[PDB]
Design a protein around this nucleic acid. Structure first.
Ligand SMILES: [Mg+2]
Ligand SMILES: [Mg+2]
Ligand SMILES: [Mg+2]
Ligand SMILES: [Mg+2]
Ligand SMILES: [Mg+2]
Ligand SMILES: [Mg+2]
Ligand SMILES: [Mg+2]
Ligand SMILES: [Mg+2]
Ligand SMILES: [Mg+2]
Ligand SMILES: [Mg+2]
Ligand SMILES: [Mg+2]
Ligand SMILES: [Mg+2]
Ligand SMILES: [Mg+2]
Ligand SMILES: [Mg+2]
Ligand SMILES: [Mg+2]
Ligand SMILES: [Mg+2]
Ligand SMILES: [Mg+2]
Ligand SMILES: [Mg+2]
Ligand SMILES: [Mg+2]
Ligand SMILES: [Mg+2]
Ligand SMILES: [Mg+2]
Ligand SMILES: [Mg+2]
Ligand SMILES: [Mg+2]
Ligand SMILES: [Mg+2]
Ligand SMILES: [Mg+2]
Ligand SMILES: [Mg+2]
Ligand SMILES: [Mg+2]
Ligand SMILES: [Mg+2]
Ligand SMILES: [Mg+2]
Ligand SMILES: [Mg+2]
Ligand SMILES: [Mg+2]
Ligand SMILES: [Mg+2]
Ligand SMILES: [Mg+2]
Ligand SMILES: [Mg+2]
Ligand SMILES: [Mg+2]
Ligand SMILES: [Mg+2]
Ligand SMILES: [Mg+2]
Ligand SMILES: [Mg+2]
Ligand SMILES: [Mg+2]
Ligand SMILES: [Mg+2]
Ligand SMILES: [Mg+2]
Ligand SMILES: [Mg+2]
Ligand SMILES: [Mg+2]
Ligand SMILES: [Mg+2]
Ligand SMILES: [Mg+2]
Ligand SMILES: [Mg+2]
Ligand SMILES: [Mg+2]
Ligand SMILES: [Mg+2]
Ligand SMILES: [Mg+2]
Ligand SMILES: [Mg+2]
Ligand SMILES: [Mg+2]
Ligand SMILES: [Mg+2]
Lengths: 130, 122, 200, 160, 67
RNA sequence: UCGAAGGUGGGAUCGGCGAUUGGGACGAAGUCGUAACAAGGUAGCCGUACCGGAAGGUGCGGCUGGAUC
RNA sequence: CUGGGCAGUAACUGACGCUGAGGAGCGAAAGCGUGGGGAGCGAACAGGAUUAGAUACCCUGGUAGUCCACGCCGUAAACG
RNA sequence: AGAAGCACCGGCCAACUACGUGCCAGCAGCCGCGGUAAUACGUAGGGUGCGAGCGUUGUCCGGAAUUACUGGGCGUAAAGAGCUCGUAGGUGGUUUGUCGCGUUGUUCGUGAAAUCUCACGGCUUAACUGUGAGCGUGCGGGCGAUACGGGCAGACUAGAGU
RNA sequence: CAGCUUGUUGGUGGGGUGACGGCCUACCAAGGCGACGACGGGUAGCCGGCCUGAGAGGGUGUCCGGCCACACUGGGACUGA
């Protein structure tokens, strides 16, 4: 078992494709921060933290339209544990030509491309969501 | 496969084959043109092709094709050889240049007249 | 070099008349050759080819030079077709044609070639000279009162003068307010096919 | 008043006791030239009949394409049976840089500014299907912002 | 090695093409006028003039001596 | 003392030729069979061993990429 | 005499994990060495039959082998 | 008034007919064309492209996502070792503190000139030439940040083992 | 191409140099390099650049500019900043 962030992305993607309304998954600070970013960008509905048998459990409810369509189109881990990926403020990645979101881990916390270019800081490219 | 596997063992391009072997870097090559003869092509063509055995100045013996209709070649005679395939003769990969040291141009030729060698008219 | 050949054949192949004037039409259909009446296959390459042919033979430019004009246009910021048109239009002999000093394009080219003009008091005789913004074009003061130039002295009313250059009184002089915009100035062609031709 | 392009015509055959019975297929692209395009396959024993059937199939199977001013909104990658097509938007200067089938589809749809590259199989039918798949995958800023919220969290420099 | 110590240095640097971070080790030879240093013994070094054919480093201080 | 060139010696290594001999490929409309493709007329392939002008045969084990009620 | 697995408990340790270039071990049958054993089967071999021929298929015999002890060999459509 | 040629015209790929020849002579980059009505051979007429050039040969990149980092694969198309254990190596669960090696921000030095890009300036234009700004992906020094990776010091039981 | 190395690896005293240094010498110790490819074989002047390419890459090092090496083949010193 390696790369829990990729595990988190895979769980969310599979549930979103299976048309599920919520997911459960072991809670870590990094996952909580990524969930906060996703909610702020509007790709999910609200999330919450429970207390499982051992440790804590993180539950995310997924957002769908009036018809049954997904608000999340894709998801892909970028900086894998076998090859870390970093970027500078000059050349932060662009997702769907700007219609998506790329998560950047900076010394000031997790940020999106817009929030990171407006601050002029780079860092590790965690994942694309769009 | 596996960036670590690539780091340990990089990509290696394919192996090509030299085609200019007798010319060995030169665009043309002089030869002595021994033992001129004729050859029948591969199965579905049934023609009579005019060829020659050329001993090149690169100290290699190759077989060349004589283009055009009608030629003045013979036994020992200096020719200028270039590259080119015939696709029906089995292993001929060289052509005699017409309009060079001993191979005079094609007589009565009127179209394209530069291949095969021919001055316009005077 | 120059073409120096029948212009009507070259218009009949491209199905468009490029000359106008006294020899505007040949008064006959467009079979450009012996087999010119054939209803032939229409490829995608053919449209691009013939559009670039129209662009070249509207101005009498040669393929090698048009090629360079293409890199200039694509390398210029903005768009591509309008920049190509602007470059092809700023040619001094074209300016002479558009300023109502010429019956055709060929004879405007010959007048520029034989050095009948000065720009900033500089004797120029290259047809491919490129005029610029705030350029004045002056006829050689020792070259006036000559028949083919004074025949255009009184006939300055029929063909319209575009809105980037300007002509003045009896001293026939040209002033360039700004570089043209050929896309809004007399396009007998679509510039979007030259670009596609120069991508294959 | 439509734009119709026949892309590929090939002669297929079926063997019987007597011999080979020949027929014709004619893949046709039909679109209004503005924002909407359709694809129809069509097949018959004679070329004009196959072309006709392709035309009605395409006209019935019209679908809508999201444009942002003469080009597509964002890059996409379409996947047919085995054909792969990549589309990217370009500045207004560019033309339509595409192969045969993709160029037919895009120019009928009414796209002026596109870089299209086919990476998978070279079959015309599958290239067309991959291109329409990518055009399906395309998105518009307005519903991506409807899906997410506060429709300014994008970049819309030109607009008009 | 009679007043000489051998120290292993490790450094990590991005792969030129694939972008992975590769770890590599060196082996420099350092000088001990007063030879007291054993196996393990993370040490600090400072490079100096050619004190020998192969020695270019001098021991500074033995920090966190071996366990 | 060191010392180029030279001399002596035993090896290493890279090529060329070589009577004769092993296979390979391509040739026409040659000779001998008919091994495979259908249950291809004894199901076929795989490993191994022996044998036989030649395709191959047979034994042992395996597989279905074969059948049977 | 001896190896592994699963479930339950949650008693214990506290990341001790995963994979693994080379390497090592095991590894059907046939085959090989030394010794023993040998009913049946059965390569090779012999005869009969079929056939134009039949170095085969079918029949009658039949040696190695198949078995055991101790070593070697290290290959299989060793396949899901 | 002293001054135009070369290549091609079956598809790719713009450009077609007649005559002669009759698996012959020959052509051909591919696959093919020629065995008596050849747009594929030779000539003519016509056409197309380019033009003081036009064709052929040779070599390199491209197309080729056919060595795949960007950017490919392994049931049957080429491709999972017969299976396991294990060395170097690669990779690593949750959580606290610290360091600031990786990472990232900024500044100083350097990254010669020419060449290259963008803007002018000068040769009648252009090629060419001068100027200014970029570029020079980097490296070294100083000063910030600590989200993630890593090191160091702990903790936990969910993985692993007993 | 899987084992290479004995001034070889290190130390001390001397010598030598414009200068540190096995650069050299006497003595002492027994090390040093290697699968992250030592030792060996093949090929090659290196770079700013040039060609190609969407880019990443690939090929190349000719004019021009910088550095290196050599001057019939091999060795040696002298004069001198
Ligand atoms: Mg393919
Ligand atoms: Mg010393
Ligand atoms: Mg011999
Ligand atoms: Mg058989
Ligand atoms: Mg048979
Ligand atoms: Mg039989
Ligand atoms: Mg059989
Ligand atoms: Mg037998
Ligand atoms: Mg067998
Ligand atoms: Mg069996
Ligand atoms: Mg405890
Ligand atoms: Mg293991
Ligand atoms: Mg192994
Ligand atoms: Mg064994
Ligand atoms: Mg056995
Ligand atoms: Mg035995
Ligand atoms: Mg035996
Ligand atoms: Mg025995
Ligand atoms: Mg028996
Ligand atoms: Mg028997
Ligand atoms: Mg018998
Ligand atoms: Mg095997
Ligand atoms: Mg088995
Ligand atoms: Mg054509
Ligand atoms: Mg005829
Ligand atoms: Mg002909
Ligand atoms: Mg010229
Ligand atoms: Mg190539
Ligand atoms: Mg490539
Ligand atoms: Mg890859
Ligand atoms: Mg493949
Ligand atoms: Mg796999
Ligand atoms: Mg198969
Ligand atoms: Mg296979
Ligand atoms: Mg297996
Ligand atoms: Mg380990
Ligand atoms: Mg480990
Ligand atoms: Mg580690
Ligand atoms: Mg970790
Ligand atoms: Mg510079
Ligand atoms: Mg100027
Ligand atoms: Mg710095
Ligand atoms: Mg447990
Ligand atoms: Mg000594
Ligand atoms: Mg000493
Ligand atoms: Mg050399
Ligand atoms: Mg490429
Ligand atoms: Mg020398
Ligand atoms: Mg000499
Ligand atoms: Mg000398
Ligand atoms: Mg002096
Ligand atoms: Mg001196």
């Amino acid at each position: 078992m390696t790369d829990p962030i990729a595990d988190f992305l895979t769980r969310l993607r599979n549930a979103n494709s299976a048309y599920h309304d919520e997911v459960s998954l072991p809670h870590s600070k990094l996952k909580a921060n990524i969930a906060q970013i996703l909610k702020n960008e509007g790709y999910i509905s609200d999330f919450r933290t429970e207390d499982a048998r051992v440790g804590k459990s993180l539950v995310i409810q997924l957002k769908y339209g009036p018809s049954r369509e997904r608000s999340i189109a894709g998801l892909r881990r970028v900086s894998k544990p076998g090859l870390r990926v970093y970027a500078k403020s000059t050349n932060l990645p662009r997702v769907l030509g700007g219609l998506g979101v790329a998560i950047i881990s900076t010394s000031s916390g997790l940020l999106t491309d817009r929030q990171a270019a407006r601050q002029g800081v780079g860092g590790e490219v965690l994942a694309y969501v769009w | 496969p596996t960036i670590q596997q690539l780091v340990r063992k990089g990509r290696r391009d394919k192996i090509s084959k030299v085609k200019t072997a007798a010319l060995k870097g030169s665009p043309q090559r002089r030869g002595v043109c021994t033992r001129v003869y004729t050859t029948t092509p591969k199965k579905p063509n049934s023609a009579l092709r005019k060829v020659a055995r050329v001993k090149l100045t690169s100290q290699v013996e190759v077989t060349a094709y004589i283009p055009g209709e009608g030629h003045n070649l013979q036994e020992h005679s200096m020719v200028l050889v270039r590259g080119g395939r015939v696709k029906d003769l089995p292993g001929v990969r060289y052509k005699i240049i017409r309009g060079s040291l001993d191979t005079q141009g094609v007589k009565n030729r009127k179209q394209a007249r530069s291949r095969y060698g021919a001055k316009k008219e005077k | 070099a120059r073409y120096t050949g029948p212009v009507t054949r070259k218009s009949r192949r491209l199905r468009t008349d490029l000359v106008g004037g006294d020899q505007a039409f040949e008064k006959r259909p467009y079979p450009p050759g012996q087999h010119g009446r054939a209803r032939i296959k229409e490829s995608e390459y053919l449209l691009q080819l013939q559009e670039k042919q129209k662009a070249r033979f509207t101005y009498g430019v040669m393929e090698k030079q048009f090629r360079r004009y293409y890199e200039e246009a694509v390398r210029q910021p903005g768009k591509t077709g309008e920049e190509l048109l602007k470059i092809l239009e700023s040619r001094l002999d074209n300016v002479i044609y558009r300023a109502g000093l010429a019956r055709t394009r060929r004879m405007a080219r010959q007048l520029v070639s034989h050095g009948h003009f000065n720009v900033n008091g500089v004797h120029v005789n290259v047809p491919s000279y490129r005029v610029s913004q705030y350029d004045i074009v002056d006829v050689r003061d020792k070259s006036l009162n000559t028949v083919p130039f004074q025949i255009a002295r009184e006939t300055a009313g029929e063909r319209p003068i575009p809105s980037w250059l300007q002509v003045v009184g009896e001293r026939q002089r040209v002033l360039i307010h700004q570089l043209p915009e050929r896309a809004q100035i007399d396009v007998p062609l679509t510039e979007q096919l030259i670009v596609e031709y120069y991508s294959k | 008043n439509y734009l119709e392009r026949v892309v590929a015509i090939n002669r297929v055959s079926k063997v019987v006791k007597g011999g080979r019975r020949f027929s014709f297929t004619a893949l046709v692209i039909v679109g209004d030239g503005n924002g909407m395009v359709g694809v129809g396959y069509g097949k018959a024993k004679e070329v004009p009949a196959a072309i006709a059937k392709g035309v009605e199939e395409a006209r019935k199977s019209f679908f809508r394409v999201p444009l942002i001013g003469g080009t597509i909104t964002h890059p996409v990658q379409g996947e047919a049976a085995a054909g792969v097509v990549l589309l990217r938007p370009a500045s207004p200067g560019t033309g339509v840089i595409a192969g045969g089938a993709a160029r037919a589809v895009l120019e009928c749809a009414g796209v002026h500014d596109i870089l299209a590259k086919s990476l998978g199989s070279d079959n015309a039918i599958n290239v067309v299907h991959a291109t329409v798949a990518a055009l399906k995958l395309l998105q518009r800023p307005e519903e991506v912002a409807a899906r997410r919220g506060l429709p300014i969290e994008d970049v819309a420099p030109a607009g008009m | 090695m009679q007043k000489t110590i051998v120290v292993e240095l490790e450094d990590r640097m991005r792969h030129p093409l694939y972008g992975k971070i590769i770890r590599t080790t060196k082996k420099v030879k350092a000088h001990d006028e007063d030879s007291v240093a054993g196996i393990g013994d993370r040490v600090s070094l400072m490079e100096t003039r050619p004190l020998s054919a192969t020695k270019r480093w001098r021991l500074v201080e033995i920090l966190e001596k071996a366990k």
